[PDB]
Design a binder for this molecule. Structure first.
Ligand SMILES: COc1ccc(C2=NN(C(C)C)C(=O)[C@@H]3CC=CC[C@H]23)cc1-c1ccc(C(=O)N2CC[C@@H](O)C2)cc1
Ligand SMILES: [Mg+2]
Ligand SMILES: [Zn+2]
Length: 335
């Protein structure tokens, strides 16, 4: 909860010169991999996508966040992502872009206030800060120093509490405080809801978040504040597991990257003497198809179909695309 090094004029100018013609950052078919390949500075192009998405929405303007404070914030986030195969700055820009499509192509903006929409798009960019490509189980199973601190401290969401700490750190500088235009009660809601949503991305809480959302949607008018809170949690979670809702070739590129992080975690566990689950073990697997089908069947397809049928009807395309992708992997297996 303290200062960071100031963003410079030159760093800002390097983002502002990126052009992006022939991309539409609001479209469900937008391809971040093609955007990255189109230029020799893919980190500047990724920052420009986030900047143009947020400014194009009208939300920072509504809530007192200047163009310069928004760009500073995006660049402070970028500096705190690591060179890891999947949980990097590209993943969080992808989640931000995807949530924009759920809100404005899927019409989920009808269920939320404008302030809640602004907090969601901002939260997407902080939600994995300083991720080291290792999950909560790694830290606890191996007695790594952060696992010892979680054990002594109480909380088992090692990663997600860390991400929240760093978000608070970035927002402590007035030059990058995107919530500085909010007054009293609203500023408090913004921080509380950002923290709640990030803490809800721990997949150990996947089942309990889903059930609380479906219960709150069953009678919305009985408790409106609860329904709003849970809708924000469920949309960030949906963005976070959205790789299987994309055009097949895009979906496959994401799957390759996360698979490599799984294997590297297994390698590090084996080296520290722990007996690894076979999903994380290079020596126990071959092609991607069977694992993507398993992820779809046991996690993503029931999640998306349940939230769509419960009240998010405008997001039907996600279920259709998941089914299409699953059929493509199944054809790979059958041949
Ligand atoms: C698109 O693929 C994925 C997306 C998110 C995840 C995640 N799983 N999970 C749990 C469900 C295990 C997370 O906690 C991650 C962190 C936050 C949200 C979701 C993340 C896993 C896969 C996943 C990774 C690898 C395979 C796979 O095919 N493998 C992995 C190794 C071998 O079994 C082949 C399948 C699914
Ligand atoms: Mg995460
Ligand atoms: Zn994530």
């Amino acid at each position: 909860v303290k200062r960071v090094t100031a963003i410079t004029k030159v760093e800002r100018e390097a983002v502002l010169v990126c052009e992006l013609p022939s991309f539409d950052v609001t479209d469900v078919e937008f391809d971040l991999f093609r955007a990255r390949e189109s230029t020799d500075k893919p980190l500047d192009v990724a920052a420009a996508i986030a900047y143009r998405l947020l400014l194009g929405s009208g939300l920072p303007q509504k809530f007192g966040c200047s163009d310069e404070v928004l760009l500073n914030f995006i660049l402070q986030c970028r500096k705190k992502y690591r060179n890891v195969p999947y949980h990097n700055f590209y993943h969080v820009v992808d989640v931000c872009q995807t949530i924009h499509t759920f809100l404005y192509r899927g019409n989920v903006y009808e269920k939320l206030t404008e302030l809640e929409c602004f907090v969601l798009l901002i939260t997407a960019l902080v939600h994995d800060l300083d991720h080291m490509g290792l999950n909560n189980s790694f830290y606890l199973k191996t007695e790594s120093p952060l696992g010892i601190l979680s054990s002594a401290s109480g909380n088992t969401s090692v990663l997600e509490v860390h991400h929240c700490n760093l978000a608070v750190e970035i927002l402590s500088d007035p030059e990058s405080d995107v919530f500085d235009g909010l007054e009293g009660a609203e500023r408090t809601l913004a921080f509380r809801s950002m923290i709640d949503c990030v803490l809800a991305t721990d997949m150990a809480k996947h089942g309990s978040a889903l059930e609380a959302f479906l219960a709150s949607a069953a009678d919305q008018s009985s408790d409106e504040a609860a329904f709003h809170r849970m809708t924000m949690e469920i949309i960030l979670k949906a963005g976070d597991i959205s790789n299987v809702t994309k055009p097949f070739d895009i979906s496959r590129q994401w799957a390759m990257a996360v698979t490599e992080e799984f294997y590297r975690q297994g390698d590090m566990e084996k080296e520290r003497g722990v007996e690894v689950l076979p999903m994380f073990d290079r020596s126990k697997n071959m092609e991607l198809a069977k694992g993507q089908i398993g992820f779809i069947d046991f996690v993503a397809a029931p999640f998306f179909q349940k939230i769509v049928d419960a009240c998010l009807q405008g997001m039907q395309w996600t279920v259709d695309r998941i089914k299409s992708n699953r059929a493509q992997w199944e054809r790979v297996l059958e041949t």
